[PDB]
Design an enzyme around this catalytic site. Structure first.
Site, short mmCIF file in Angstrom:
data_model
loop_
_atom_site.label_atom_id
_atom_site.label_comp_id
_atom_site.label_asym_id
_atom_site.label_seq_id
_atom_site.Cartn_x
_atom_site.Cartn_y
_atom_site.Cartn_z
CG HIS A 62 38.49 -3.73 43.07
ND1 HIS A 62 38.10 -2.41 42.94
CD2 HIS A 62 37.45 -4.48 42.63
CE1 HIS A 62 36.88 -2.37 42.44
NE2 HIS A 62 36.46 -3.61 42.24
CG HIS A 92 37.82 3.99 45.37
ND1 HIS A 92 36.86 4.58 44.57
CD2 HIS A 92 38.94 3.92 44.61
CE1 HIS A 92 37.42 4.84 43.38
NE2 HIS A 92 38.68 4.46 43.36
CG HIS A 94 43.61 3.33 43.74
ND1 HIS A 94 43.25 2.24 42.98
CD2 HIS A 94 42.65 4.26 43.54
CE1 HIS A 94 42.10 2.54 42.34
NE2 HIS A 94 41.69 3.75 42.66
CD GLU A 104 44.74 4.01 40.52
OE1 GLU A 104 43.68 4.64 40.32
OE2 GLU A 104 44.87 2.80 40.22
CG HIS A 117 40.55 7.79 42.83
ND1 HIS A 117 40.91 6.66 42.15
CD2 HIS A 117 41.53 8.72 42.72
CE1 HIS A 117 42.10 6.91 41.64
NE2 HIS A 117 42.52 8.15 41.96
CB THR A 196 42.40 3.88 37.50
OG1 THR A 196 41.81 3.65 38.78
CG2 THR A 196 42.47 5.40 37.25
N1 LIG Z 1 39.42 4.23 40.25
S1 LIG Z 1 38.38 5.26 39.56
O1 LIG Z 1 38.86 5.57 38.24
O2 LIG Z 1 38.20 6.36 40.47
C1 LIG Z 1 36.80 4.52 39.36
C2 LIG Z 1 35.67 5.26 39.70
C3 LIG Z 1 34.39 4.75 39.55
C4 LIG Z 1 34.32 3.47 39.04
O3 LIG Z 1 33.18 2.73 38.77
C5 LIG Z 1 33.65 1.54 38.27
S2 LIG Z 1 32.49 0.39 37.80
N2 LIG Z 1 34.95 1.48 38.21
C6 LIG Z 1 35.42 2.71 38.70
C7 LIG Z 1 36.70 3.23 38.86
ZN LIG Z 2 40.12 4.81 42.01
#
Ligand SMILES: NS(=O)(=O)c1ccc2oc(=S)[nH]c2c1
Ligand SMILES: [Zn+2]
Ligand SMILES: NS(=O)(=O)c1ccc2oc(=S)[nH]c2c1
Length: 258
Positions: A62, A92, A94, A104, A117, A196
């Site tokens: 993803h 990471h 988006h 986002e 993020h 998210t």
């Molecule tokens: N996209 S985010 O909200 O930053 C986020 C951060 C950490 C996470 O751990 C899992 S499991 N799913 C996640 C989504």
């Molecule tokens: Zn994220």
């Protein structure tokens, strides 16, 4: 988990397997700058990344995550709206298929080309898995990316992407300093939210920086060459891996600046 960002498994479908998708504190949200109120009680954010220990970069199907050693207080976020110490575990992004979309969070409905993020977990909970089960378990520092001049601190990431093109691939990524991904100002907006992506757990204190960082068209172009699919499967470009803004409901977004 079969969720994704396609028309058949995208954000509109997530609620069927993750009912909390229609919850009371879901993220992201649109940040209405005129309605967000300055909170004089908020403290300056404390970002201490000097001892950060990056380890690996992974394409998880993803997005791609740059992972850190979080078995000790090496890279931590404190201050701001937070009480306690939050350890950096991974970062990471988006992003979109076009420069006009990808983030986002939005600011007065404006969408940025991408959003970074930096994920941190509350050390009082012992480990990340326990932290995501708590209302104040995570603190995610969100930074917008706009297309303009290149971001030097991002190039090492861009150059390793060829080695993790498909889902499940990883590569060594040691000695990467995340301080090079930050803007000059640490002014921010903050509100209680969620992950998210599924499981969409409502465990995040969101801290979104007001100042976007600039990255070059070539840098974001390379993000768009990644694949959602695994090796040997039909190629699906990893683009538009963002969830749209969710209802703010009974929440207030607070600003650290006037
Ligand atoms: N996209 S985010 O909200 O930053 C986020 C951060 C950490 C996470 O751990 C899992 S499991 N799913 C996640 C989504
Ligand atoms: Zn994220
Ligand atoms: N995880 S989800 O987004 O609810 C979702 C949506 C569509 C799906 O089709 C199959 S097959 N598995 C699926 C999971």
């Amino acid at each position: 988990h079969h969720w994704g960002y396609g028309k058949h498994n995208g954000p509109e479908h997530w609620h069927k397997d993750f009912p909390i998708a229609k919850g009371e504190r879901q993220s992201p949200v649109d940040i209405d700058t005129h309605t967000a109120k300055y909170d004089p009680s908020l403290k300056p954010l404390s970002v201490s990344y000097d001892q950060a220990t990056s380890l690996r970069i992974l394409n998880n199907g993803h997005a791609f995550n740059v992972e850190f050693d979080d078995s000790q207080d090496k890279a931590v976020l404190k201050g701001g709206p937070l009480d306690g110490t939050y350890r950096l575990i991974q970062f990471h992004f988006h992003w979109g298929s076009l420069d006009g979309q990808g983030s986002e969070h939005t600011v007065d409905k404006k969408k940025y080309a991408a959003e970074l993020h930096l994920v941190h977990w509350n050390t009082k909970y012992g480990d990340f898995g326990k932290a995501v089960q708590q209302p104040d378990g995570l603190a995610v520092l969100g930074i917008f990316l706009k297309v303009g001049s290149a971001k030097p601190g991002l190039q090492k990431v861009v150059d390793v992407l060829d080695s993790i093109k498909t889902k499940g691939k990883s590569a060594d990524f040691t000695n990467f300093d995340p301080r090079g991904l930050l803007p000059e100002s640490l002014d921010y907006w903050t509100y209680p939210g969620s992950l998210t992506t599924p499981p969409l757990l409502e465990c995040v204190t969101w801290i979104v920086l007001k100042e976007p960082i600039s990255v070059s068209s070539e840098q974001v172009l390379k993000f768009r060459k990644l694949n959602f699919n695994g090796e040997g499967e039909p190629e699906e470009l990893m683009v538009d891996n963002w969830r749209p803004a969710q209802p703010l409901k009974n929440r207030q977004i607070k600003a650290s600046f006037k």
